[PDB]
Amino acid sequence: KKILLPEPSIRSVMQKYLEDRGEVTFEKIFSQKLGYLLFRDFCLNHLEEARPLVEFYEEIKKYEKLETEEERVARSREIFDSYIMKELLACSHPFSKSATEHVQGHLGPPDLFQPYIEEICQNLRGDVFQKFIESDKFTRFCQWKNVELNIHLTMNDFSVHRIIGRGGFGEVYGCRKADTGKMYAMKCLDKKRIKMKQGETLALNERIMLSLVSTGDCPFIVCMSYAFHTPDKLSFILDLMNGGDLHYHLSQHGVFSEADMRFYAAEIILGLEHMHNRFVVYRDLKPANILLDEHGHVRISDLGLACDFSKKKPHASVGTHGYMAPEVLQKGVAYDSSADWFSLGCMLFKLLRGHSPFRQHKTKDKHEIDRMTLVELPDSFSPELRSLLEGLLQRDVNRRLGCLGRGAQEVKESPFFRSLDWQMVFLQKYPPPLIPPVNAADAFDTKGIKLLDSDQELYRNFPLTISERWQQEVAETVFDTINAETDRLEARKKAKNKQLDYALGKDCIMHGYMSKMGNPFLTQWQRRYFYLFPNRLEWRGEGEAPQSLLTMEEIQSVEETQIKERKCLLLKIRGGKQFILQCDSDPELVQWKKELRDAYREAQQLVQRVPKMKNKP
Amino acid sequence: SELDQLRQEAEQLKNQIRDARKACADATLSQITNNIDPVGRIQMRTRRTLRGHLAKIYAMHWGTDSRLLVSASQDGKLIIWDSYTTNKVHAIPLRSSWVMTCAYAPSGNYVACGGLDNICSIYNLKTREGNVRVSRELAGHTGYLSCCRFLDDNQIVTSSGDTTCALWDIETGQQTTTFTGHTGDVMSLSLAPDTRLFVSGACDASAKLWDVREGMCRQTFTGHESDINAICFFPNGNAFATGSDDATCRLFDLRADQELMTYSHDNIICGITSVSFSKSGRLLLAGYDDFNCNVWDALKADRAGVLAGHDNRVSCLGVTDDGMAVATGSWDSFLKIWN
Amino acid sequence: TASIAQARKLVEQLKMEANIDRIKVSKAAADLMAYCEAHAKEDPLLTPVPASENPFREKKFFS
């Protein structure tokens, strides 16, 4: 159940694993949630040289998050005086002359210390970062990274609760990830229902779109943290929204007022801005696809019909009729974010009148709604609401609100939102109008179907884990508590050796734990500590020197094999013998394969040019 | 051309050396020794079997005490054995896995080793608190270390795959004298008893006699058709034997400046890895690639004995200074004492 | 190969190798055979030795 970290000896394998990918740079470890938490622990408590450099960084970050100048003026005094001015007194400021110039005169905004941020990174990008790598904190980073890169989720990793959503090709459950206790939403799609309706592209596209958006921690979009699949189900691990969709609440509460709709419009706009900044068109904005959380705030969900116009624009008529833009409903017309703004105007119109803007007099047929392609706004609408809707529902894209160059900002500046402070909207400070009290997210609604290997290979690259999402979940739940339990455990292992290293001082390449196979009929897997040398591969037992080894000359091939649905390495020896090794994690399997392949190929090519060592007839 | 002349009279000097040699072949060693009695069947049995090395054994060396011996193995370790008790005196872990040769100082206070690290590492055995620390790392060669032998506790002679030999000063670490001349990877060397001279076999199928103090080469002995992998001095210092990949051992005299005898047989085709004489020089022991050590009548060129006990290539051998026993190291990770 | 000092150093060495004093092979061979007879009395591998003097047969008492 609980997450368990590998032993500190994992550092030898993980460090070479990351170095082969350039992931041991200051820029890449400092910008990770868990890496930052470990780097600051090293700097604050284990290095007086870097302690003032990081305290200055954190005080700046706390200053950037400040809301009002009433607070920015008071805090900027302490930060400048305590950290910048005190050193100039003792004439020991390690920042460029010009860096202080930009901040000095600027007196009587949140981004005033940005020139200093670059200077702080320079003072840490280097020798301070070197001692951190050599420190025990980078070893703890390798312990956590090994867990992240060994994630293989199944249904058993979650405690599934009641159903919170039905529709499409499956249903959605509330669930709890057992190892950290994080509450998520599991969107579980049946593959048989997908293949029956040829909707494989739709399901595959949803994760590709979720992957483009699930970064940055957006509070107005149902983001994704994991994606895995069983032989029969596609599982999306998403943000929990147990308040139902607007399509349901629109029929229970009824039509909304202008001010109650200003709340929903504000949060959807910020959500659309996040997708448009990442070049994603939603194309299916309607009250059914807008969920409520426990408090009443909303998110954009179900990115199945979402498209990516990063390199080439789309032009097909895809979406829900009654909300599609003129540059979309017709065929062969390219478009981009301009479609979502027209969809917003159609959706916002529905929250006020209870029906689609073009579904007049509760018509039922679909072609009765797509006819009106150019707009009669009810008299009860305020003057500012008309100016917003008219801009959002203009037939022309050149005269459309939100399509004039600045994007979502043009919609924020509408006089309908004069009363709003968009910073407070982002912080979810404004009170939601409807707090949900349970069968609140249903939609508008066969066996003997084949599931060949050609179908299972369509979902081949479906498994995915968002690194930013996983590290955040860990950091807020068990990261502090697991490091403490691991520290108390590693200290007992270290203190026990006194009352009780073979790789140091030599030319050892890599060392770690593997499990060679003895008699396979006995499930005999012996965990030995292995030491890789340029010419041999040694392993040892419990508190004993390496009994035997395996020379690089003997190895003919390193191959990957499966034993009882468990990945192992297959070493073929010169005498026709076989040597099987099970690794405890995916990165260990990858690195041991590369390093063993490199070693035996180099060693065999080197012995060839040594008459004392090579083989002769 | 001045270069074409120096090559013309160079080939013209080589014919003078061959003629001077052929002017001395009045008789053969086989004719001289035709009268003396044969040695019979030298029957040696495995007295000790030294176990510990985890991979191939590449080289060995006896101490002057005729009891302690050092060994270098593919397992990146040096082991100093007590041949009488089979107990390990020291298990030195090496800093480079690619070891090829090892040496035991006459005093028994220092040992040396080396290989593809291109460094001769001197280890001090008797330290302050009974440790085995590296006392010096002799760096200077541009190729792998193939052999090394102590003169005393301050000078040592090395051979390398850079086609050179070298004389080192241990305390200062300097490459005192260099011995250039070979055109191929120098494989083995052997010191004369008086230690003013030493011979060296290389992959150019030639062996050279060098003067340690003068730093020059005095005589160059040719004859082998393949790489010379081993070499050892005759006890009286006037001759030396070589072993090569041509499946022959050959004997050369310094005063006659030519080959005297060839130790071969159509029954043997594998190369020779190591050679050594008995205390009196009457026996010539050679380790072969067919997992065997053959005992040769040095005076009559007849095969007199065989040491069968290793399941892989016998990579090195050596006779104690008192001539009591013969050690044999092989690619099967075992050392066996024969007597 | 194309060096003149390389050819000089080769020639002057072949002079040192050619202008030595050589003896007859019969003289050199007799000196070797005479040495083997002079020390055949002192060679344990050439003549059998009892188990007492042999530290490897069946001794086991050492220092």
Ligand SMILES: Fc1ccc([C@@H]2CCNC[C@H]2COc2ccc3n[nH]cc3c2)cc1
């Ligand atoms: F497979 C499904 C299941 C439910 C839905 C509903 C159909 C009605 N409109 C909203 C969507 C999304 O449903 C939810 C419902 C709750 C959620 N929590 N987190 C993501 C959630 C998604 C779509 C596809």
Ligand SMILES: [Mg+2]
């Ligand atoms: Mg279109």
